[PDB]
Design a protein that fits this description.
By secondary structure, chain B is α+β, with helices and mostly antiparallel strands. Chain B contains two helices and four strands; from the N terminus they run αββαββ. Classes of the chains: A little secondary structure, B alpha+beta, C mainly alpha. Bound molecules: magnesium ion (29 copies) and zinc ion (ZN). Chain A binds one RNA strand through residues 1, 4, 6, 8-14, 16-21, 37, 40, 49-68. Chain B: The modification Phosphoserine is found at residues 15, 107.
Chain lengths: 71, 111, 47
Amino acid sequence: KKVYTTPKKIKHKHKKVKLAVLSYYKVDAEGKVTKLRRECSNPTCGAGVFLANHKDRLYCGKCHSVYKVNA
Amino acid sequence: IRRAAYGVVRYVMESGAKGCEVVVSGKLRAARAKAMKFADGFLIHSGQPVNDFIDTATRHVLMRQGVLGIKVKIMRDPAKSRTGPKALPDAVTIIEPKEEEPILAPSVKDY
Amino acid sequence: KEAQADAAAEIAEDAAEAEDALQDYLNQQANNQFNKVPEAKKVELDA
RNA sequence: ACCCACUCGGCACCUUACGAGAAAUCAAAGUCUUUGGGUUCUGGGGGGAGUAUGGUCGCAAGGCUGAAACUUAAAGGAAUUGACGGAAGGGCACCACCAGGAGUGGAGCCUGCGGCUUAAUUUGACUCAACACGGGGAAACUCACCAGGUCCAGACACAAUAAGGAUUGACAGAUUGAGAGCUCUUUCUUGAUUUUGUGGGUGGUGGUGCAUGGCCGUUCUUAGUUGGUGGAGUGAUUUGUCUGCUUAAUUGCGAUAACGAACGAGACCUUAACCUACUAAAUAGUGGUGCUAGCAUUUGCUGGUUAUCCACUUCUUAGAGGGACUAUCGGUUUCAAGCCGAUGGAAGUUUGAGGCAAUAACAGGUCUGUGAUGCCCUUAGACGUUCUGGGCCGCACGCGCGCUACACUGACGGAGCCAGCGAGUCUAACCUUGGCCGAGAGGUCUUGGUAAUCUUGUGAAACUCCGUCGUGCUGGGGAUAGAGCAUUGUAAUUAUUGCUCUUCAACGAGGAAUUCCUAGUAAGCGCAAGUCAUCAGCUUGCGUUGAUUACGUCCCUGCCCUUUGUACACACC
Ligand SMILES: [Mg+2]
Ligand SMILES: [Mg+2]
Ligand SMILES: [Mg+2]
Ligand SMILES: [Mg+2]
Ligand SMILES: [Mg+2]
Ligand SMILES: [Mg+2]
Ligand SMILES: [Mg+2]
Ligand SMILES: [Mg+2]
Ligand SMILES: [Mg+2]
Ligand SMILES: [Mg+2]
Ligand SMILES: [Mg+2]
Ligand SMILES: [Mg+2]
Ligand SMILES: [Mg+2]
Ligand SMILES: [Mg+2]
Ligand SMILES: [Mg+2]
Ligand SMILES: [Mg+2]
Ligand SMILES: [Mg+2]
Ligand SMILES: [Mg+2]
Ligand SMILES: [Mg+2]
Ligand SMILES: [Mg+2]
Ligand SMILES: [Mg+2]
Ligand SMILES: [Mg+2]
Ligand SMILES: [Mg+2]
Ligand SMILES: [Mg+2]
Ligand SMILES: [Mg+2]
Ligand SMILES: [Mg+2]
Ligand SMILES: [Mg+2]
Ligand SMILES: [Mg+2]
Ligand SMILES: [Mg+2]
Ligand SMILES: [Zn+2]
């Protein structure tokens, strides 16, 4: 055959990061829980799931894609 | 390879077959392909009687070394034919006459 | 000889075979039997 | 001199074999395990080797005498059977010739093969038995090639990670050929399904057809193989199975230490021929009558009418039978098998044509048909797989299968107008009539058909007729190219095909070579089927028109058969 030419530069798939996750429910004091990170408006999402915060962005992850909700 | 084949041939023959044939093609233990014919009794290889009497099958026996052919051919006693022609087209039988008591000046009987 | 006698047992096995000698359930309907309630919880839709 | 008989002693030959031999063979090579007439010489596995050394002879070259170490399991004899031979003798055949046909070989293009080119131009095959072959007519797919982008569909076993998250997905934006979260930016989501590592699997048009199955091609357009009782040999074997004769045939006749047999050939099977005789039919069809149109009238002639009825089976159809068995007679021959001619016959070339087809052989082709397969290689930056685009068509040239032509037995324009084998749409867009629109290509509205019912009488083509052209590359020929319109398909650019106009090449019967063919055959012609969304210059069948020439020979070629040689038997690679 030929056996391995290539121009270097391989790729990596994904880390998924690490992220100890939910430290985000904000209490005030003892024991009131004020719950940061607003929750999604669609029936498939039972308000357990939330919206991410970027520039211009509030995004539901439980919708894999669907329903951009902007505020 | 013989003991098995020859064993088959004996059972088929004893099962009343006019004849049968066993072929083994492949490679056993020797890197080169060899083949054996095993056949007994009577078989015709040509014509319509082929379809009528002989029954064949091939079978691939897959083993460690490789794969062998089993080609088996069984010919059935045409006498027993049941539904079909009861002999080869070859067969011609003449019926056997009977001794006569000739002469006997004519006379006649009555009723 | 070992082939001929091979067919001795082929006849034997053939001649001795010429004569020789509820969990009720039904999982089709068991899910219909287990259809009894107190099997779930649904409440949602805040804010 | 010659003839006949007889007898000694010669050179030989013939036939037997009592007898001998391992056998070929031997009146000695016989009278040898039932071993003794006399006598001389030589040999004791194959090499080493007639070498070394000594002695002796010779002018010489060389003669006589003549070891050993070491090496090696065979060397060797006669015969049997195969294989082969650039030996002899017999055959067979249009993949051989003769007598001829029609051609290829020259020309343009079509197609395949080599070559070169290429990022890649995927690859198998190289005399008959590679090269219009792989059903191989590749725009994606196909696809195996090249340029680049994804995904695991890495079972399962242990181990590691980890319920504080093992892992999964993605909006926009960057990015990308791309509304692929491929990757990255930000950070939601997901819940033990994955992940990481090892072991172990799995896919591969990756290698090996020189590891195989199976299949197929070839030997083979051939006629060979074998066993029973008997004859010969110690035996492997042989005779049967053969000079001749005859057949397409080891088909027979005849000769015969053989007789009578089986596989193969033959029989058989299919298809094309023949049925006024049997069984029938609105899904085939005729006659008669109602209904009905036109022309003539004197009764006639030529049509319409899926059922207005009655009758029938010649034509059509396919079940069952009949028929041919080279019959009758006559020529010729061992008056044998056969052969030939004539009459009759639907049929007399194995009736024509196929299918089936023994033993055996090849390192023939196929791992690129197969979830047939051993083993090798590869297996996440993949030789797995998928997506995007390209390539298999690339063009100084050599080879091969074809197609269309060079015209007046013709092109062309009108018109006469005649087949057969097929195929055709259910969870569907197949075969398509008819009416419109359009020069055409085609478009549109509908309709019959799962089919002897509709397409379809497939009104096909060559061909027949009446004209235009008049030998001038002409109006023969249609290569090449421009310009426009359509159709298939997501896609047509390197132009899928179709239509119209214009352009109007080579080719004026083709050197040496070489293919194919003996009757509804050749050749000319178009049709249907496969392939197929679109694409036949291909193939497989079909019918149409329909000749010239053999009816022989072994000259060329090819291949069988004996005879003969063999030191080959892995068999002349
Ligand atoms: Mg036979
Ligand atoms: Mg036959
Ligand atoms: Mg003797
Ligand atoms: Mg000639
Ligand atoms: Mg010629
Ligand atoms: Mg060819
Ligand atoms: Mg592609
Ligand atoms: Mg994917
Ligand atoms: Mg693994
Ligand atoms: Mg491993
Ligand atoms: Mg494979
Ligand atoms: Mg190879
Ligand atoms: Mg081979
Ligand atoms: Mg093979
Ligand atoms: Mg011929
Ligand atoms: Mg012989
Ligand atoms: Mg009839
Ligand atoms: Mg006649
Ligand atoms: Mg080879
Ligand atoms: Mg294969
Ligand atoms: Mg090609
Ligand atoms: Mg004309
Ligand atoms: Mg128009
Ligand atoms: Mg001209
Ligand atoms: Mg013209
Ligand atoms: Mg000519
Ligand atoms: Mg077609
Ligand atoms: Mg083809
Ligand atoms: Mg010999
Ligand atoms: Zn949501």
